[PDB]
């Protein structure tokens, strides 16, 4: 799609940007963002708006570790939204970008996939109807069906609320919160805690509690605990 983003007609450039933004969405990718760096530098305004939207859709819940361009783009959103002389159709993308970036208190990531590669349906329907804000504003307000909370939880006797705290021995910056403006090896993640599928595979069950997670935990979902 890389050469297709450089077409003579800017509708195809908008479409190429949005295709990059909805295909590799939820996974921070180097080259897809690299194609979107010069996309927000062009005289046509709606392709600038689509470039901002597609770039904010692919930097979700990733704090300055897997992709190092997050802080520069986060400054770019505020720079465009605070500029006194810009296209209003362009700053539509700027105001919506802050919404789709820090969605749901950094707890929900849009993902068309699921646990095992099976296709997840409300997310796909939500993205397809999200492509219609060029024709109606409330029609592409549908995004909450595209948002799934990424947490590991699970309760022993139906509603028996346990206490599991362990997180892997990786440095506490890959999984860190954005820490808004307003060196321990291991970290602690209490019984409700977020986990994104970038270092989902690194965590371990704690070996201090007698309860064990039964299913070989590599999934964001529901577990049972056998208190031995």
């Amino acid at each position: 799609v890389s050469l297709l983003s450089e077409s003579y007609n800017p509708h195809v450039r908008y479409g190429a940007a949005m295709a990059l933004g909805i295909c590799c969405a939820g996974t921070g990718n180097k080259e897809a963002i690299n194609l979107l760096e010069p996309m927000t530098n062009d005289p046509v305004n709606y392709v600038r708006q689509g470039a901002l939207i597609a770039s904010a859709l692919i930097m979700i819940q990733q704090t300055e570790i897997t992709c190092p361009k997050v802080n520069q783009f986060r400054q770019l959103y505020s720079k465009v939204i605070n500029d006194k002389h810009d296209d209003v159709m362009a700053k539509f993308g700027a105001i919506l970008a802050q919404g789709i970036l820090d969605a749901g208190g950094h707890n929900v990531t849009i993902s068309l996939q699921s646990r095992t590669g099976h296709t997840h349906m409300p997310s796909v329907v939500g993205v397809l109807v999200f492509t219609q804000f060029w024709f109606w504003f409330p029609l592409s307000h549908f995004l909450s069906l595209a948002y799934t909370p990424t947490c590991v939880i699970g309760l022993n006797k139906d509603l028996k609320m346990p206490k599991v705290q362990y997180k892997s021995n990786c440095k506490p910056s890959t999984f860190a919160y954005p820490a808004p403006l307003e060196e321990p090896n291991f970290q602690l993640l209490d019984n409700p805690a977020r986990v994104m599928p970038a270092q989902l595979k690194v965590l371990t069950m704690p070996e201090t509690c007698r309860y064990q997670p039964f299913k070989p935990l590599s999934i964001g979902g529901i577990i049972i605990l056998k208190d031995t």
Partner: protein
């Protein structure tokens, strides 16, 4: 109480008649009244247009006795479609495609009858074969600037799909009025009619021109190709060692080899293989 994401439909005959009447009165401004309907509260359709006798000055054009207009709109009810007068158009030859001071004067009078009154500005001078310059304007209240004129509940009529010009932004544009986006609706009866008005029937397709003129034409093209290649020899063999960045600056004169060769290749091949193919078709189809 809201001006939504509006749209104007124009038919094919309306645009053709528009351009013909604009060209027929090329140095001055011609007049006209539009025929159509309000299909919904969102969009406005123009299905027909017609012209009237006028009376033109150097800077102005006025109407005549309007018993023509009343009797014409009475008689057009009888044959077929009884629409209404949804708008008016004029022409602006060589101008900025904009509403002037006296153009906006009668727009209030046309808007006082019906709210959804559309002005249309065409220009037959700046219009070229591939694209006709056209614009539709809607008068906005000059008393209300503090509020919004159109809420823009979507992004249809915006910097989307069109950009405001410079000369329209001088004489008015988003001031005192605004613009609306034009799309063309094509019905199947005219759709499968418009794409076939260039072909011929079977005598044109199967016709060898003549062989004497073909031989003389090939003789002439090969004869000039001789001297053209003789010039091409010196053009290649000179090739002064100094980077084309200035060899394109000494080429800007009358120099012509390497450029007329492939054109002669094209006009030789595409006139010989077609004639030979048609000769074979003629000699074994009829028998």
């Amino acid at each position: 109480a809201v001006d939504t994401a509006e749209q104007v439909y124009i038919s094919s005959l309306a645009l053709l008649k528009m351009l013909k009447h604009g060209r027929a009165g090329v140095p001055m401004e011609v007049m006209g009244l539009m025929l159509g309907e309000f299909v919904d509260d969102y969009t406005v359709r123009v299905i027909d247009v017609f012209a009237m006798p006028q009376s033109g000055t150097g800077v102005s054009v006025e109407a005549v006795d309007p018993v023509f207009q009343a009797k014409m709109l009475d008689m057009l009810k009888q044959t077929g479609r009884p629409e209404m007068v949804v708008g008016w158009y004029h022409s602006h030859p060589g101008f900025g495609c904009w509403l002037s001071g006296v153009d906006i004067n009668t727009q209030q009078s046309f808007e006082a009858l019906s709210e959804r009154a559309v002005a249309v500005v065409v220009d037959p001078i700046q219009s070229v074969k591939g694209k006709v310059v056209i614009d539709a304007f809607r008068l906005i209240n000059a008393n209300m600037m503090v509020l919004g004129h159109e809420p823009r509940q979507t992004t249809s009529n915006l910097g989307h799909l069109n950009k405001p010009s410079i000369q329209a932004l001088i004489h008015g544009l988003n001031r005192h009025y605004y613009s609306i986006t034009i799309n063309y609706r094509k019905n199947e009866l005219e759709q499968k009619m418009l794409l076939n008005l260039h072909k011929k029937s079977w005598m044109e397709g199967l016709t060898l021109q003549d062989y004497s003129e073909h031989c003389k034409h090939n003789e002439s093209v090969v004869k000039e190709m001789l001297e053209l290649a003789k010039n091409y020899n010196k053009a290649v063999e000179e090739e002064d060692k100094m980077t084309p960045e200035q060899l394109a600056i000494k080429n800007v004169g009358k120099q012509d080899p390497k450029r007329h060769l492939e054109e002669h290749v094209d006009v030789l091949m595409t006139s010989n293989i077609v004639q030979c193919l048609a000769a074979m078709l003629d000699t074994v189809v009829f028998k």
